[PDB]
């Protein structure tokens, strides 16, 4: 960015967030949302959508 602000936001469809490679849900990683010992969430697995078909 040559402009003054370098912050940009990108919308994400909820369909993209899921487990990597469509694996079964483990104790700490449920539906692409990683969980610590508590109920909090640390990080999310976001895939890439391919219109060509794969």
């Amino acid at each position: 960015s040559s402009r003054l602000f370098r912050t940009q936001f990108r919308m994400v469809s909820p369909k993209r967030i899921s487990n990597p490679n469509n694996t079964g849900d483990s104790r700490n990683c449920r539906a692409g949302v990683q969980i610590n010992d508590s109920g909090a969430a640390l990080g999310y697995y976001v895939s890439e959508d391919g219109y060509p078909g794969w």
């Binding site: 490679n21 469509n22 694996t23 079964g24």
Partner: protein
């Protein structure tokens, strides 16, 4: 009845060595399936 006394010092539980290396290295994902059978497919992929 019995007048003897004893004290226990060391208690150990021996464990035989075991480490699932092949699961750790290669098979890294699980696919629980509710159906009766599982299909695995291949495709030749030889183009002249």
């Amino acid at each position: 009845s019995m007048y003897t006394t004893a004290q226990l010092l060391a208690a150990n539980e021996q464990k035989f060595k075991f480490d699932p290396l092949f699961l750790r290295l290669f098979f890294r994902e699980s696919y629980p399936f509710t159906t009766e059978k599982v299909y695995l497919s291949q495709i030749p992929g030889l183009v002249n």
